[model samples]
Target: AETVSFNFNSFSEGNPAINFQGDVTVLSNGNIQLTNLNKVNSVGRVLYAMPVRIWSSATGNVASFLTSFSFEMKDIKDYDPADGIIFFIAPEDTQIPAGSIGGGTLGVSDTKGAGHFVGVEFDTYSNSEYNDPPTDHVGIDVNSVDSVKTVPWNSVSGAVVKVTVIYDSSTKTLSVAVTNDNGDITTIAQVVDLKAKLPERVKFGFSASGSLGGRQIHLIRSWSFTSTLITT
Candidate 1:
């Protein structure tokens, strides 16, 4: 049996035990800052340093997990919000794809085979080329930029949003809920076979991008995760 758990109420001022790349930085206020304001095509990612044991091949048992976080996206006046944020799980050595610096892609791979990830996107822009729903929304993605499931999202800029993600092994169900500062909550879920879609061990984290001249700041205020894997 293996149990993995961690709580990051807030990131510290300087360096922490997190792996971050590109434009991502830890702000003086202890928030994980994902993009630079007014910077075009800026991309970033912050990931957990250790991979989680997601399943056991010997026993054919998958893990159950839960994660939660709070974040804020402050939109700059006169600039449209482009792209958005992503909460993702991928192979342990996942990297930001070179072409993921702009809209639609949302800091993940745009081409198939370039990256393999399961992600939840908080999208603010529509990409006709990518089949986005033409509104702010939440999407569940598997390997591709296209979402398997999406729902309209009413979250506004400058307000805090709280999010929770839960996966049940027995049912192979993944559920996500987002609560805006106005107390509006949006929930979405689906049946996902993690054993089939991902490796037995994987890394998880957040990613975001600034693109097409849209200016905004993505801030992660807190995060927590817990998981249990049964193995013999």
Candidate 2:
């Protein structure tokens, strides 16, 4: 069994190859800023941790992983923010799909198998395409942007948010939980076989975008992940 671990105090300090594009940057506030406060027809960015294999025929099997991060979004103005971000696991190539113009797509609108990935999206807008509610929510997507399960988002605005994504192969379950500085918790889970849903080895990262008329600044304060070999 092989293990992978790293803590991202900031993008400036990390062992893996960090790939990003568009408006992403290390903001003056010390967070990894993904998007700006205002924009029209704009796409933010995607950040990736490269060369990490979730499961491999030779290295290991039936793996488990836990990723946690603290992030924030400030209304910053009266403008309503539509689009959102995603914490995802994908194959080697991590690129935002051209079709995902940021609406309900949340930037993961690629065709099936284009990147062969799964995501837990923090969606700020409701789209009929995925039958989303009018308010912000969370969803779990496997291979497709359309969520298999959607839950109402229950967190405070402009406050630091802590999120945890855990995948346990022994139970074949993917669980996501979000907590705010106030101690409010919102959790969702789904049963999934990563071996079947994703390739043997995979890369993981974050993707973000802004909506047509509304947008906000999404920033990450810290991030970390660990891969623990699970055995019976």
Candidate 3:
């Protein structure tokens, strides 16, 4: 058996355990600031430095895991918010795709390559091109920006959003829960084998983007994760 666990109550500058890409930066206050608050066409990603074993090919067993984080999306410009945030898992070679900096892409898709992964998106802007809901939503995606399942995201202004994701190997189900400051919770889950959708080893992280005209701030306050892999 193999177990992995880590906690980041907040992120600090130059933390080697963290990998920041594109415009991602750690604020002096220790919070992760993804994307620029006033800059348009900004995109960024933050991930754990090391990949974790999600499954064992020899034993045909997948890992069970839990990840939780606190985040916030604020429209500093008082205008509509563009794009959104994603908690994603992808192969070791994953990187922020080129020209992938807005809604419909959310810095995670570029179907040409960097497109293989699983994600739970907290989308504030709806892109009709992607068949998104008219309102904000929480959706599950596999290899594509379009979601396979979605539920309305009852987002409140200036509220801190808390999210929890769990994967149970026994049932092979991936579940997500998003809670708002008002105590409202939206839940969604999918029954799918992650091993079938991703590689045996994977990296997990958060990604965000600000559109060409939107001036929004995506901030992650804290995060923690734990997992147990039944490696024979």
> lDDT of each structure?
0.83, 0.72, 0.85
Model 3, span 132-220: residue lDDT tens: 89999999988877888899986565789999999999898999988888787889999868989999989999999877676477889
* Position 135, candidate 3: lDDT: 93
TM-scores for every predicted model? 0.94, 0.87, 0.95
Q: lDDT tens string, model 1, 10-46?
A: 7864445688877888887889998877577788889
Candidate 3: global Cα-lDDT?
Answer: 0.85
lDDT tens readout by residue for model 2, 1-232: 5688878876653424577656677766567777655655455554555566666666447678888988887665666765677788876765667655665565666433233578888887676766777678888888766678888985356888889988887788999999867777889999978877777667777777776567777777888888876433
- Which one wins on lDDT? 3
C-alpha positional error of residue 201 in candidate 3 after TM-score superposition, expressed in Å? 1.2
Q: Which of 1 and 2 is ahead in TM-score?
A: 1
Q: Which candidate order results from sorting by TM-score in descending order? A: 3, 1, 2
* Candidate 3, residue 193: how far the Cα is off, in Å: 1.4
Model 1 ranges with Cα > 4 A deviation: 13-16, 111-114
